Amino acid sequence: GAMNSSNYAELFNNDIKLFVDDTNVYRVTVHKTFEGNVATKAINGCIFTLNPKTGHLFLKIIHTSVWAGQKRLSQLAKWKTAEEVSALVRSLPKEEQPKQIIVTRKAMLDPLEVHMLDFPNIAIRPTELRLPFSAAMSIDKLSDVVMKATEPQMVLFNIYDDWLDRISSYTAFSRLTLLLRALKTNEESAKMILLSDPTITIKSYHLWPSFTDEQWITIESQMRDLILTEYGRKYNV
Amino acid sequence: MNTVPFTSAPIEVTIGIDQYSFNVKENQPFHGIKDIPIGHVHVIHFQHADNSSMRYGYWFDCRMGNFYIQYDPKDGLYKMMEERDGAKFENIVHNFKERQMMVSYPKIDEDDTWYNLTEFVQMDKIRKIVRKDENQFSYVDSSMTTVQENELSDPAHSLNYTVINFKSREAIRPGHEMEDFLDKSYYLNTVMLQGIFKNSSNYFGELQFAFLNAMFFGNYGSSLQWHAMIELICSSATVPKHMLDKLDEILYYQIKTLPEQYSDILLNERVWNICLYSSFQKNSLHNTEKIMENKYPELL
């Protein structure tokens, strides 16, 4: 059944699993027409498919051409997500195929179950966790490859950089969720915290700055403070 | 007009014949049911006064043989049996009729209810769903599970309804996942109608049989089968016009006949709301929508 606070350690065991987030697949700008009606313009999206144990991110870029001449795009977006995840599983050698896929939104369950009928032993699960994967497009290098794509493209990243050399996958996932939660709550403030000291750079092969263990503790504190402030604002408490 | 004689009635029991029912007292001189209309299947059903658990009964067609009921004190139930000796049977029935120890099948001349509930139901199809080939009649009860329920445990005592599963390779063509899941027309028309049932009459026959087993025995698996077969039609954008018109009549008579007090356990809220208000066929079941809105507006 559903992934929650109770069965959280299961994410970091030795059973291969992937999280799938579809919240950036179908993306639009809403604008006025000459006649003063409203219309949407699609922009490039992505499927966020993440191994929480290894940090391996399978970023399938969704080019705006996939929506051309299609109806009910928010519904199609769920099925296109399930098609691309199914294609990804089929492309992996048997020993690399996930035993579980956890969808971040319950609306993905039926589309993914139907696309994965050929894999009856792969469990498709919802989660009660409110994961901030929607903020993936606040990571500058992920945003850049999505917006520059001129065709459908899969790009592979490690969303943890080299953190697993120094910390466990539990701690790396906690750091990632806190960074993404901050970026989601106040993007400008989160990015200011990450880049304010110009002496700490992002390696060409990394997503996040090259913080020492001590600098990560300071960064993580600044992100928690950003999140609590913003909360007191939202809720006048 | 055919007759199902009873050897005796040693235990107090409610006896059903089709949509009718009679209370019989322990050792009441009851010797059976006469004037049963030829041309239809019939069901004779039982609920013991001392154990209102296990409704059970027998589907039969009097054209296929001479049937009687005899209580078995070892197995503790009223059993259907075939009398192979024509003269012995005619002589038994004639005596019981002369002594007027039989109830008459109480059909009102105007009343087409039983025809309307059994229009497509045929004994030969019943005998493939309920397997016991040494008998020409079929036993069903409250607790019998379906082949589909068993997959998800005695195969001899199972209801072999056609398995319908919306999230199965059978239902979904590779490369047509979304199309086939949101519009079940290929599953209805190619897999089920052309492939398995051969025609709409056999499909409706199974649907009507599943309803009647749900209603007369509170058979849960039968209720699941009845709903799945309705939902497969209502979830198909492309259905022959004659099938939709016939489905509206079938369901109308089923909803008309259901006891008002059993709507809560025999009607699936999700399926009916989907079929009448969201599905492709939401505007194709006028008679059914009108009786459901007037009789069970709570469910909706």
Q: For chain A, which residues make up each domain, given as ranges?
A: 9-163, 164-237
Residue A206 near residue A161 (C-beta atoms within 8 A): yes
> Residues of B with CB below 8 A from A117's CB?
167-169, 172
Integer CA distances (angstroms), B105 to B4, B42, B254, in order: 11, 11, 20
Cβ of residue A61 closer than 8 Å to a chain B Cβ: no
Residue A65 near residue A93 (C-beta atoms within 8 A): no
Report the SS3 class of residue B217: helix
The 10 Å Cβ neighbour count of residue A191 is 15
Q: How far apart are CA A24 and CA A135, in angstroms?
A: 9
Please report, as a single letter, which amino acid is at residue B11.
I
- For A164-237, CATH number out of 3.40.309.10, 1.20.80.40, 3.40.50.300, 2.40.50.140 equals 1.20.80.40
Residues B167 and B19 in one domain: no
Residues B139 and B153 in one domain: no
Please report, as a single letter, which amino acid is at residue B245.
D
Residues B171 and B189 in one domain: yes
Q: Alpha-carbon dihedral of residues B165, B168, B174, B179, nearest 10 degrees?
A: 40
Domain boundary among B118, B143, B168: B143
Q: How far apart are CA B69 and CA A40, in angstroms?
A: 73
Q: How far apart are CA B16 and CA B216, in angstroms?
A: 9
- Which one of A25, A117, A118, A124 would you mutate to disrupt binding with B, by most B Cβ within 10 Å of its Cβ? A117
Q: How far apart are CA B62 and CA B37, in angstroms?
A: 9
Closest CA to A20 of A118, A138, A141, A104: A104
B48 bridge partner residues: B13
Closest CA to B210 of B219, B201, B200: B219
Residues B107 and B197 in one domain: no
**Number of domains chain B is built from:** 2
Method of structure determination: X-ray
Residue B143: how many CA atoms within 13 Å on its side-chain side? Answer: 6
Residues B165 and B300 in one domain: yes
B228–chain A nearest CA distance, Å: 17
Residue A100 near residue A125 (C-beta atoms within 8 A): yes
Cα dihedral sign for A166, A168, A169, A172? negative
Q: How far apart are CA A95 and CA A99, in angstroms?
A: 10
**Residue of chain B minimizing CA distance to A115:** B177
Q: Token digits for A131?
A: 């994961």
User: What stretch of H or E contains B33?
Assistant: strand B32-36
> Residues of A with CB below 8 A from B174's CB?
118
CB burial class (10 A; 0-12, 13-18, 19+) of residue A33? exposed
The 10 Å Cβ neighbour count of residue A112 is 23
Cβ of residue A87 closer than 8 Å to a chain B Cβ: no
Please report, as a single letter, which amino acid is at residue B243.
M
Q: How far apart are CA A30 and CA A49, in angstroms?
A: 27
Report the SS3 class of residue A100: strand
Using the CB atoms, write b or e for B118-155: b if 16+ within 10 Å.
bbbbebebbbebbeeeebbbbbbbbebbbbbbeeeeee
Q: How far apart are CA A223 and CA B148, in angstroms?
A: 53
Integer CA distances (angstroms), B283 to B207, B234, B238, B280, B291, in order: 21, 10, 14, 8, 14
For residue B35, the enclosing domain spans 1-143
Q: What is the CA radius of gyration of chain B?
A: 20
Q: Token digits for A154?
A: 């899969």
Q: Which residues, other chains included, contact A110 with Cβ-Cβ below 8 Å and sequence gap of 6+?
A: B167, B181
Resolution (Å units) = 1.5
DSSP annotation of A18: E
Is A9-163 assigned to CATH 1.10.10.10?
no
Q: Token digits for B245?
A: 């018109």
Outline where chain B has alpha helix (H): 86-98, 113-118, 123-129, 147-151, 177-182, 185-186, 200-217, 220-234, 241-257, 263-266, 269-273, 286-295
Task: Compare CB distances from B178 to A79, A113, A118 and report the shortest one's residue.
Answer: A79
Please report, as a single letter, which amino acid is at residue A201.
T
Q: Which residue has the tokens 């036993």?
A: B139
B184–chain A nearest CA distance, Å: 13
DSSP annotation of B162: P
Cβ of residue B270 closer than 8 Å to a chain A Cβ: no
Q: How far apart are CA A17 and CA A11, in angstroms?
A: 7
Domain boundary among B110, B143, B176: B143
Integer CA distances (angstroms), A71 to A66, A67, A74, A86, A102, in order: 11, 8, 9, 22, 27
Residues B156 and B300 in one domain: yes
Domain boundary among B143, B160, B195: B143
Q: Which residue has the tokens 């299961």?
A: A10
Greatest alpha-carbon pair distance for chain A in Å reads: 59
Q: Within the 126-145 window of chain A, which residues sit less than 8 Å (CB to CB) from chain B? A: none
